[PDB]
Design a protein around this motif. Structure first.
Motif, mmCIF file in Angstrom:
data_model
loop_
_atom_site.group_PDB
_atom_site.id
_atom_site.type_symbol
_atom_site.label_atom_id
_atom_site.label_comp_id
_atom_site.label_asym_id
_atom_site.label_seq_id
_atom_site.Cartn_x
_atom_site.Cartn_y
_atom_site.Cartn_z
ATOM 1 N N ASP A 411 -14.532 53.263 11.137
ATOM 2 C CA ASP A 411 -14.412 52.046 11.913
ATOM 3 C C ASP A 411 -14.848 50.837 11.082
ATOM 4 O OD1 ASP A 411 -16.330 50.203 13.874
ATOM 5 O OD2 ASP A 411 -14.347 50.585 14.666
ATOM 6 N N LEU A 412 -14.152 49.719 11.258
ATOM 7 C CA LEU A 412 -14.455 48.480 10.533
ATOM 8 C C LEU A 412 -15.596 47.710 11.185
ATOM 9 C CD1 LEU A 412 -10.750 47.718 9.867
ATOM 10 C CD2 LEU A 412 -12.437 47.556 8.027
ATOM 11 N N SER A 414 -17.649 44.832 12.643
ATOM 12 C CA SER A 414 -17.388 43.537 13.286
ATOM 13 C C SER A 414 -16.033 42.943 12.881
ATOM 14 C CB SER A 414 -18.540 42.572 12.948
ATOM 15 O OG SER A 414 -18.429 41.348 13.643
ATOM 16 N N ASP A 623 -9.120 48.906 14.991
ATOM 17 C CA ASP A 623 -9.810 48.880 13.703
ATOM 18 C C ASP A 623 -10.467 50.220 13.354
ATOM 19 O OD1 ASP A 623 -13.192 47.711 14.333
ATOM 20 O OD2 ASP A 623 -11.882 48.930 15.600
HETATM 21 CA CA CA Z 1 -15.390 48.053 14.681
#
Ligand code: CA
Ligand code: DTP
Ligand code: CA
Ligand code: CA
Ligand code: CA
Length: 903
Positions: A411-412, A414, A623
């Motif tokens: 997961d990316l 922010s 994301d």
């Molecule tokens: Ca994220």
DNA sequence: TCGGTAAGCAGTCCGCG
DNA sequence: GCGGACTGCTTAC
């Protein structure tokens, strides 16, 4: 000390400010504020003021605020922009507090209150206030005292004084169990008549005037009731004494069963705890009664009493008062855990806004950005009218519905704020446009590089790389705060698991919990001491670690919410910096990023596994990517692992040492492709998921987009003592699903993921056999009740009437003539139950206020006519059928040739 | 002067020899 | 009684 404001109001040409002075004393002042606004001027004019695009402006200093407002109107009519801050109290705060505000919460009067009103003729409407106020408990944060105003004589009964001695006693001994830690903080004041009670309360209020006013439902009940009751008895002018500036605004909603009103008290900041909870808690509850929320948050039991509330004062005045006191305390207990008042203060002073404006991300960001630009002598643009226009958001991959054995997710960090910062997206950093190719062409790196000069988004926008944007600058500050707090939250979470592991072998000794800061990972020496601690001390440490985690969660998730709020605000027509070019620059970049890295990860894993064209990424939303790790496990061979933790360690290492560097390389290339200002696409491993080694558990499954379940052993670096189910979107996660059904579905899932098909079948059989014995409330569905009147045709359902609304209309007909029956409130939640054909209610379902027992006069009929068959099929069987068909499992043993034998 | 989009499922209405 | 177009509600991002 440095001074800081408490409240600010504009009243005509006056600013009214309550504040704390250099000596730490509370003061009030009225200021005839002279505001400034700005007009574009010719280049030949020497000025220090420039708009955000560098165009020169002339300052207009006005003799008063009305003069400034009138000039705005004339400019509109001329057709020229009137620049500057048009909310003059924000300008006033910015001028008066031209520094970073350091506030002292101990000087801020936070009042928590609630009232009681006996009513023999239904709900006591605040707009009418026809019944005596017969109790007030008002807690003052400065005194740390509960001030209790008790009415002894009333048209509804004359009662004896409340006894603190009986209040303190256990309920099992006839007492009220008022917590021991507040007994000594109660100041009890009995009154022989309501007029003297209320006059004293107002005098009290003058002496101890709330800055922050809170409590449960105070905005919709306690405040308008007190105001209207005082108004009816003494007159409107007396009621206005509730405002330190003697000014109020009455807002009447009226639609359509009864007129409700909201009262604005100028010079007070009302933060109804119900609204704080809804904004900052990130729960969706089936009920918002204080009893329900207190049980959820604190694990305290419901405040039990006999008979209806309308008869509680007369029958048991002792309990009546104690319960009023405990109700006020419960909100304080919730805030001690959740720390929403602290958050509100932090955010309010950071932005330099009225504290109540924390409810508005648009007001908060307008103020932050205004203050930032003002420091540079820059002039903010005039707000403009825009038509509402839909625009595209994120990408979500269609998953193949299936069981998925080994899964690793990434997961990316922010994302949307990181895109803003990476690309440099701001109103004043727009450099131009480029001709767009289809998104797929960017994802596959076949489109022409958009620019070798400017920083780009695949929506066609270009931004300057070599200058700062106010949006990136200010979003970065809040992001960095968020990051700090999330660090504390995760360390506390990790520390919790250390304590849970130690609780497997507690020592038989008398010791104390260790004096530690749970916001930081325990040292080796602390971990050694923990292994020697008793169960008692360990459980106390676990409580403290979890409270630390909650505090960090509050601080981080709401700062995350504020910064994500800015990205969304760019697409709200009322935001000063509304611009769909910027809003879509963000979302389109996000779509590219997810699909780009999907490609990169598939490419990389095929390469290291020595194959070509296999799909490793099974799913992604916005994301995140979910990677099937089956081939990774099979590459080494499952038999090589000693236990579950061994393969978890292996995948953890694989993710961090091999995959993350490849992901990083992939995103660095994307950054140079878009020629971005700064690489900030940081995609780290999130979940490691699978079945316990040696088990028949399926590990995970997807039914579709936004609908999946995983058996997780490690989440963001927290290695769990016990595996945790990560369930998204499925009925277990929905507040509309009956409580006992959520429980049963989760256990069905737990068994599928951890144990296998036979285990599932065993549980399903038991639940179906016992379903009819569950309490009716535990098996009732829940829904919000919107636009009830719309479908109400002579008490009967009109066309297209929703199921739950039909239930409410059925209920309304059932309680007609009943005086003590609780009314369903528009917009609030209701329990819903289906009814068998031929029922005396005359319809297929019934609904009643959620979080309550259905009234006694119809309770026995509901129980008799409840349709258990329909209930089971709709809420339990149908969702379970969805889970199992997706997972290729059966919840019931299917017929086969084997049925011919006697097993 | 009030001040984000994507997407799944339950339910109503309608078609349906 | 089921599938399709539509409202409503709710959750995942
Ligand atoms: Ca994220
Ligand atoms: N509540 C929300 N309001 C507005 N936008 C949101 C919200 N939740 C998610 N989004 C959008 C913006 C996010 O950057 C993006 C990715 O969501 P998500 O992964 O939940 O959080 P995040 O990437 O902002 O933070 P984190 O660092 O916790 O992953 O989706
Ligand atoms: Ca009460
Ligand atoms: Ca031990
Ligand atoms: Ca995410």
């Amino acid at each position: 000390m440095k001074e800081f404001y408490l409240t600010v109001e504009q009243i005509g040409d006056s600013i009214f400010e309550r504040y704390i002075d250099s000596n730490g004393r509370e003061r009030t002042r009225e200021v005839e504020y002279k505001p400034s606004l700005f007009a574009h001027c010719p280049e030949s004019q020497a000025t220090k003021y420039f708009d955000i695009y560098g165009k020169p402006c002339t300052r207009k200093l006005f003799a008063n605020m009305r003069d400034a407002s009138q000039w705005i109107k004339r400019m509109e009519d001329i057709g020229l922009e009137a620049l500057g801050m048009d909310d003059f109290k924000l300008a006033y705060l910015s001028d008066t507090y031209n520094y970073e505000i350091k506030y002292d919460h101990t000087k801020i009067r936070v009042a928590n209150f609630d009232i009681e009103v006996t009513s023999p003729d239904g709900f006591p409407e605040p707009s009418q206030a026809k019944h005596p106020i017969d109790a007030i408990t008002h807690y003052d944060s400065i005194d740390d005292r509960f001030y209790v105003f008790d009415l002894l004589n009333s048209p509804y009964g004359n009662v004896e004084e409340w006894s603190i001695e009986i209040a303190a006693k256990l309920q099992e001994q006839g007492g009220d169990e008022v917590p021991s830690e507040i007994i000594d903080k109660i100041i009890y004041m009995p009154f022989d008549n309501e007029k003297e009670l209320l006059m004293e309360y107002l005098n009290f209020w003058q002496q101890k005037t709330p800055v922050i006013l809170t409590g449960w439902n105070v905005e919709s009940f306690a405040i308008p009731y007190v105001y209207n009751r005082i108004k009816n008895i003494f007159g409107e002018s007396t009621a206005k004494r509730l405002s330190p500036h003697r000014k109020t605004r009455v807002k009447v909603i009226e639609n359509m069963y009864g007129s409700r009103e909201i009262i604005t008290l100028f010079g007070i900041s009302v933060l109804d705890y119900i609204d704080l909870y809804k904004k900052f808690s990130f729960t969706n509850q089936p009920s918002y009664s204080l009893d329900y929320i207190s049980e959820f948050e604190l694990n305290v039991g419901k405040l039990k009493y006999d008979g209806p509330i309308s008869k509680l004062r007369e029958s048991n005045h002792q309990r009546y008062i104690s319960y009023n006191i405990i109700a006020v305390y419960r909100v304080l207990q919730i805030d001690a855990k959740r720390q929403f008042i602290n958050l509100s203060l932090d955010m309010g002073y950071y932005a330099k806004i009225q504290i109540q404006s924390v409810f508005s991300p648009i007001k908060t960001w307008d103020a932050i950005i205004f203050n930032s630009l003002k420091e540079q002598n820059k002039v903010i643009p005039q707000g403009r009218s825009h038509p509402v226009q839909p625009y595209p958001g994120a990408f979500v991959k269609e998953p193949i519905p299936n069981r998925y054995k080994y899964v690793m997710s990434f997961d990316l960090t922010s994302l949307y704020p990181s895109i803003i910062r990476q690309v440099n997206i701001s109103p004043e950093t727009i450099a131009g446009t480029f001709k767009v190719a289809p998104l797929h062409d960017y994802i596959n790196a076949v489109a022409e590089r958009p620019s070798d000069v400017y920083s780009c988004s695949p929506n066609g926008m270009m931004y300057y790389k070599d200058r700062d944007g106010v949006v990136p600058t200010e979003i970065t500050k809040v992001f960095n705060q968020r990051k700090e707090h999330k660090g504390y939250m995760l360390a506390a979470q990790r520390n919790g698991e250390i304590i849970k592991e130690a609780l497997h072998n507690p020592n038989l000794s008398v010791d104390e919990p260790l004096d530690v800061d749970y916001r930081f990972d325990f040292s080796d020496e602390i971990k050694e001491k923990i292994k020697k601690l008793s169960a008692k001390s360990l459980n106390e440490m676990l409580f403290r670690a979890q409270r630390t985690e909650v505090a960090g969660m509050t601080a981080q998730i709401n700062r995350k919410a504020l910064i994500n709020g800015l990205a969304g605000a760019l697409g709200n027509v009322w935001f000063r910096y509304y611009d769909l070019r910027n809003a879509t620059a963000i979302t389109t970049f996000g779509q590219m990023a997810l699909q780009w890295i999907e490609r990169k990860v598939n490419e990389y894993l095929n390469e290291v596994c020595g194959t070509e064209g296999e799909a490793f990424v099974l799913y992604g939303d916005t994301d995140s990517i979910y990677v099937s790790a089956d081939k990774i496990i099979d590459k080494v061979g499952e038999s090589k692992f000693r236990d579950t933790n061994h393969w978890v360690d292996f995948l953890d290492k694989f993710a961090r040492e091999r995959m993350e560097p490849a992901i990083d390389r992939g995103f660095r290339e994307m950054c140079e492709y878009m020629n971005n200002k700064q690489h900030l696409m940081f995609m780290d491993r999130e979940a490691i998921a699978g079945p316990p080694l040696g088990s028949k558990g399926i590990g995970g499954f997807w039914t579709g987009k936004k609908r999946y379940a995983l058996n997780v052993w490690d989440m963001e670096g927290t290695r769990y003592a016990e595996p945790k189910l990560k369930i998204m979107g499925l009925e277990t996660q929905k507040s509309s699903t009956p409580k006992a059904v959520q429980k049963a579905l989760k256990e069905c899932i737990r068994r599928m993921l951890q144990e296998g098909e036979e285990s599932l079948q065993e549980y399903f059989k038991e639940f179906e056999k016992e379903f009819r014995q569950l309490n009716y409330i535990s098996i009732a569905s829940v829904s919000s009740a919107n636009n009830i009147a719309k479908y109400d045709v002579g008490g009967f359902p009109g066309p297209k009437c929703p199921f739950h609304i039909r239930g409410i209309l059925t209920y309304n007909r059932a309680i007609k003539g009943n005086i003590d029956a609780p009314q369903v409130v528009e917009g609030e939640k209701v329990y819903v139950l289906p009814l068998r054909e031929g029922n005396p209610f005359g319809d297929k379902c019934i609904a009643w206020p959620s979080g309550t027992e259905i009234t006694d006069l119809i309770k026995d009929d509901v129980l008799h006519w409840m349709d258990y068959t329909v209930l089971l099929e709709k809420t339990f069987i149908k969702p379970l059928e969805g889970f199992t068909s997706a997972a290729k499992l059966d919840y019931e043993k299917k017929a086969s040739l084997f049925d011919m034998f006697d097993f």
